[PDB]
Each structure stands twice: as C-alpha cells, then as structure tokens.
C-alpha cells in the first residue's frame, strides 16, 4: 500500500510511461545526423538512413548500435512486467527490481547514442532538431526516473538505534 | 571477467531459491547485489 499508493510513486511511474515512447520515437525516427556538403544532405537513424537532395530517399547500410537497443527494448519489456503485477497480489518488493531494468534500459540507450555519434565521428557538419534531443531526453528520462523509483521503495535511513531496513511493515 | 561473473551470478540464483523472491528484495544489500550482477553481464555481452 504505502510504497504503491503514494503520490510520489504514481507521479514517478507515469513519468516512466511517458519516456517509454520517447525512445520508441527515436527507434523509428532517423533524424539526428544532418549532413551538409552542398545537394547531398543525409538523415541517419537506427534503422533508416536517408539521403535527401524533393528526392527523399531513405535506406539502410554501426551494427553495434542496433543490437544494444534490443536490450533497451528487452529490458523495457521485462521492466514493465514486474511493475504491472506489483500492484495486485499484495507484492510491493517487486517494485524494486522493475526500477532496475528501467535504469539498464536507458543505459543501453546512452550506448547507442554515442555509437551513432561514432557513425558521425568518422563521417559536412552534424546537427539535430528532433532525435538527439528526444533520445538524449529518453535517456535523461529513464535513467533519472528509475533511480527515483528505486529510492522510493527502499525504506529510509533508520535515524534511530532501533530501526532497521527491512523491519516489519 | 567471464569466470567471476558466472560465480556471482550463481550466488544470486541460489539466494533467489532460498528466500523465494519476496525475502530476497527485503535486504538492501541484495538489491545492490542484483544491480551488480546485471551490469556485470552487460559488461560481458557488449564487450564480445
Ligand atoms: C543502492 C542499493 C542498495 C544499497 C542500500 C541497501 C544496503 C544498505 O545501504 O544498507 C544500509 C544499512 C543501514 O544501517 P543498519 O546497519 O541497518 O543499521 C544499524 C543500526 N541502526 O547500513 C548503511 O546505511 C551503510 C551506509 C551506506 C554506505 C553504502 C555506500 C554504497 C554506495 C553505492
């Protein structure tokens, strides 16, 4: 009840539910590399890679950055299963490991950010107005909310010589 | 790096069996021990 009915844990969990799609924005958007030779502009992503002159042409090809984000989706499933059943059946400990996978969700995203910065670093400018600031918001969401979700279900620093973490109720 | 990671995994599967989950996530060193076992696996897989 008291870990799972509190307003600080339900504001937090819905804020998890927002940025779960912000990565899913970035998983099918291809926008956070803007090449500019001057035309030969390109629009890189995680699957699609799109050279525009109009003649919009998006295609495929840096395969490290895809496989990591499978576990940024594989954890993101497995993070949600525990969190869903942690409301029924009077289990509330289970809210703690679901916070773990959400941290390791965004940490797989931060990997795939920098690798698609290394698909830029070897490859004329770099510019972003959509994907970089959403995926480096989804990282900034998921890493920060799960840690907050983690702190809100661990009990407290005991403050007094009789209290103990894990004490009855 | 792989050889130790399997061992501290296998202390964590055992410490799930004995306490049956509800009692494992009650002691907050084990919550930290769960955190280390996961990120140590991702150390192996992302390296290879
Ligand atoms: C992070 C997730 C896991 C960490 C929290 C769970 C383990 C833990 O921190 O235990 C806290 C414990 C509380 O003190 P305790 O010994 O129970 O009280 C004695 C009588 N008052 O004893 C402590 O508070 C230890 C002091 C915290 C220092 C740990 C540093 C960890 C850095 C990461």
Give one word for A159, left, alpha or beta, with left for phi > 0 and alpha for psi -120 to 50. left
Q: What is the CATH number of the domain that holds A18?
A: 1.20.140.150
Q: Are A165 and A158 in contact (CB under 8 A)?
A: yes
Single out the residue of A111, A107, A118, A110 nearest to residue A136, CA to CA: A110
Exposure string for B18-37, b = 16+ CB within 10 A, e = fewer: eeeeeebbbeeebbeebbeb
A159 Cα–ligand 1 center, Å? 12
Using an 8 Å CB-CB cutoff, list chain B residues near A104.
38-39, 42
Q: Round to whole Å and give the CA distance between A14 and B29.
A: 28
Q: Is the separation of the CB atoms in A36 and A127 below 8 Å?
A: yes
* Total tally of structural domains belonging to chain A: 1
Structure obtained using: cryo-EM
CA dihedral (A31, A33, A37, A40) positive or negative: negative
Ligand 1 site-directed mutation target among A158, A159, A162, A163, most atoms within 8 Å of CB: A158
User: Considering only CA atoms, which residue is closest to atom 23 of ligand 1?
Assistant: A157
Q: What are phi and psi of A52, to 5 degrees?
A: -115, 145
A41 in Cβ contact with A35 (< 8 Å):
yes
Say if the Cβ atoms of A165 and B22 lie within 8 Å.
no
**∠ CA A36-A40-A41 to the nearest 5 degrees?**
50
Any idea which residue has 């956070």 for tokens?
Answer: A32
Q: How far apart are CA B35 and CA A154, in angstroms?
A: 14
Contacts of A69 by beta carbon, 8 Å cutoff, 6+ apart? A27, A46, A108, A109, A112
Cβ neighbourhood burial of A88 (10 Å; 0-12, 13-18, 19+): exposed
- Domain of A44 in residue numbering reads as 1-169
Contact A19, A134 (CB under 8 A): no
H helical segments located in B1-48: 2-17, 28-47
Interatomic CA distance for residues A62 and A69, integer angstroms = 12
E-assigned strand segments in A33-78? 41-44, 49-52, 56-59
Tell me the structure's resolution in angstroms, rounded to a single decimal: 2.9
Q: Which residues of B touch A101 (CB under 8 A)?
A: 38
Query: A7-26 and A132-151 helices cross at what angle (nearest 10)?
Result: 150
Rounded to whole angstroms, the Cα distance separating B37 from A39 reads: 50
Residue A61's CB is within 10 A of a number of other CB atoms, namely 10
Residue pair A63/A74 in contact by the 8 Å Cβ criterion: no
């Amino acid at each position: 009840m008291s870990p799972t009915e509190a307003p600080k844990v339900r504001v937090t969990l819905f804020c998890i539910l927002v940025g779960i799609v912000l990565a899913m924005t970035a998983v099918v958007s291809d926008h956070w590399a803007v090449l500019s030779p001057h035309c030969e502009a390109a629009h890189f992503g995680l699957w699609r890679i799109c050279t525009k002159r109009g003649e919009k042409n998006c295609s495929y090809f840096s395969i490290s950055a895809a496989a990591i984000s499978v576990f940024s989706l594989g954890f993101l499933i497995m993070g949600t299963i525990c969190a869903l059943m942690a409301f029924r059946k009077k289990r509330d400990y289970l809210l703690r490991p679901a916070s773990m996978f959400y941290v390791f969700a965004g940490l797989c995203l931060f990997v795939s950010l920098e690798v698609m910065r290394q698909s830029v670093k070897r490859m004329i400018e770099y510019y972003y107005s959509w994907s970089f600031a959403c995926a480096c918001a989804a990282f900034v969401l998921l890493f920060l909310g799960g840690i907050s979700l983690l702190l809100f279900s661990l009990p407290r620093m005991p403050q007094n010589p009789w209290e103990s973490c894990m004490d009855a109720e | 790096n792989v050889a130790f990671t399997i061992i501290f995994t296998l202390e964590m599967i055992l410490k799930l069996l004995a306490f049956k989950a509800r009692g494992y996530f009650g002691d907050p060193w084990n919550v930290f021990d769960f955190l280390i076992v996961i990120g140590s696996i991702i150390d192996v897989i992302l390296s290879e």
